């Protein structure tokens, strides 16, 4: 790869370019620094990229195209600079150039082949109508991909991709005038998603996955109205009749049940309140191991409910006597026992935990404090088993997350949200120090590196940019260091943490960066001397 | 919204 | 919130 070759100004080197460094290479493009995406997505070069794809895609004769996967690939790519980078910006004469070329694969009487090869470069394509906007342009070929697909498509890795792309462009379509004002009359599309949402054949089947965004995408059509409007109605009653909640095709149910409550009238399907029903089918286990803590989980043995209450249990006594708590909770707090609730699997959490407790899955877990002032309010830590989590538990970030409900109780007043200045160093750097003491490598590398942050940089991080470095790895550090070195002055902050007095802290830890940065650095370097 | 054919177990807490 | 497609999953 060399992407400094797709910086020309002409657009046959930037051709050249693409055709004989493949996807793989194009790829870099996704990522470069902004000097690189500012070239290599000119307007003209866009365009007459385009061109020569639409004589190319013309011409093509099926089997997969390395150059095709390649252009369309480098296409789409410009669309997701332009959306990203403000110093990427097309003219008008650029997408009907790329619609152009999307029509030419499209058209070409190989579009429906089912193979590997074809299903790389058809990626590619189906991708492009959501990169370009063109979500209303291929409706029909949404609806024949729907229609079409069967066991021996499904045998395809590529071909999988590919049609899956079909749902990235219904959701894509909610922001294309010309799709909300024409979907709602798609009665064939509607009939066909329905129907590959009720395929039988893909339970427990490598496409199951796209059965569940069909049926996620269907629920969402209700909240358009048209002719299609009593087919999506009709073929979602039979999704909740066919499936369950919990059980067999339960993914394809519940993705289904999740846009329909959204969007629609639960009661006209006759699933209001099926959340609370799912928590009590899927985390079936009830593990209490203190007053101070209570397992809900999904499928763990009684080995791993005993590790994980005495890992806490552990955890919380070194959390008590570490921050001098007296075992006192700040005011205004009644979170009396977190719930631990465990699914069975990442797939699991990403399945049943999103209706269960109204959160995103796409992450790794999370603590929920609530508003610890409301009566009837529940802390709820939210996770999920794995099998390269720590034994004898193995439950996926237990250890951290746990310290969060400690701290959210014994250190910091009011609810997540309730502080007024910065505070990520201090609530990161606690879980980690708390969970992982002195056995932490990470920290002695990021150290070793040369790359370093001061004190008053460690304290003014935030989750911005997610800078997991800065925000893990250093704010440990500077926590481990404030304890073992100024452990009265974190119990001066912690009055003022405690009572919701956000500008004293800031005022508090202000002092410390001015004082204490030289200090900071010989702390840093006999942990680096240790280790060595 | 629609999940990809491959998704990550080991994730960063939200 | 909409967000352009980035790189699909190359099978392991
Ligand atoms: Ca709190
Ligand atoms: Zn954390």
């Known amino acids: 790869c060399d992407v400094e070759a797709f910086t020309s100004n002409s657009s046959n080197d930037v051709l050249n370019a693409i055709k004989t460094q493949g996807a793989s290479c194009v790829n870099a493009l996704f990522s470069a620094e902004s000097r690189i995406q500012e070239a290599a997505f000119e307007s003209g070069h866009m365009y007459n990229i385009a061109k020569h794809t639409t004589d190319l895609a013309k011409a093509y004769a099926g089997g997969g195209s390395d150059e095709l996967e390649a252009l369309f690939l480098y296409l789409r790519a410009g669309y997701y600079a332009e959306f990203y980078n403000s110093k990427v910006s097309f003219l008008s004469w650029v997408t009907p150039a790329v619609k152009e070329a999307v029509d030419a694969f499209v058209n070409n009487a190989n579009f429906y082949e089912n193979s590997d090869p074809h299903g790389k470069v058809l990626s590619e394509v189906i991708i492009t109508m959501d990169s370009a906007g063109l979500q209303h342009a291929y409706l029909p070929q949404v609806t024949q991909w729907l229609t079409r697909w069967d066991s021996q498509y499904a045998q395809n890795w590529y071909m999988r991709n590919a049609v899956n792309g079909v749902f990235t462009i219904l959701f894509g379509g909610q922001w294309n005038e010309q799709f909300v004002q024409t979907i709602g009359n798609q009665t064939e599309l509607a009939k066909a998603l329905g129907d590959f949402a009720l395929r039988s054949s893909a339970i427990g089947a490598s496409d199951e996955f796209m059965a569940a965004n069909a049926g996620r995408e269907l629920g969402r059509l209700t909240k358009y109205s048209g002719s299609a409007s009593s087919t999506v109605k009709s073929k979602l009653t039979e999704i909740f009749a066919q499936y369950e909640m919990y059980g067999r095709g339960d993914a394809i149910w519940l993705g289904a049940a999740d846009t329909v409550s959204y969007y629609a009238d639960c009661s006209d399907y006759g699933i209001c309140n099926f959340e609370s029903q799912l928590k009590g089918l899927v985390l079936s286990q009830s593990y209490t191991c203190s007053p101070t803590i209570r397992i809900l989980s999904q499928n763990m043995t009684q080995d791993q409910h005993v590790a994980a209450c005495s890992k806490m249990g552990y955890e919380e006594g070194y959390f008590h006597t570490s921050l001098e708590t007296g075992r006192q909770p700040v005011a205004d707090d009644y979170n009396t026992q977190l719930q631990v609730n465990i699914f069975d699997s990442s797939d699991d959490y990403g399945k049943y935990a999103g209706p269960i407790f109204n959160i995103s899955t796409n992450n790794g877990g999370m603590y929920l404090e609530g508003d610890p002032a409301t009566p009837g309010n529940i802390p709820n830590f939210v996770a999920y088993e794995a099998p390269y989590a720590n034994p004898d538990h193995f439950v996926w970030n237990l250890e951290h997350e746990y310290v969060h409900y400690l701290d959210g109780r014994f250190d910091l007043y009011g609810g997540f949200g309730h502080p007024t200045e910065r505070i990520v160093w201090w609530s990161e750097g606690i879980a980690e120090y708390v969970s992982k003491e002195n056995d932490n490598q990470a920290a002695i590398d990021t150290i070793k590196d040369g790359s370093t942050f001061t004190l008053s940089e460690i304290f003014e991080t935030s989750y911005d940019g997610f800078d997991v470095d800065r925000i893990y790895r250093w704010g440990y550090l500077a926590v481990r260091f404030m304890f073992e070195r100024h452990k009265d002055d974190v119990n001066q902050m912690l009055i003022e943490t405690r009572q919701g007095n956000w500008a004293n802290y800031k005022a508090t830890i202000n002092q410390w960066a001015i004082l204490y940065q030289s200090e900071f650095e010989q702390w840093q370097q006999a942990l680096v001397l240790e280790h060595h | 919204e629609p999940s990809q054919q491959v998704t990550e177990i080991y994730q960063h807490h939200a | ?12």
């Open chain 3, 1 to 12: 919130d909409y967000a352009p497609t980035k790189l699909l999953p190359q099978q392991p």
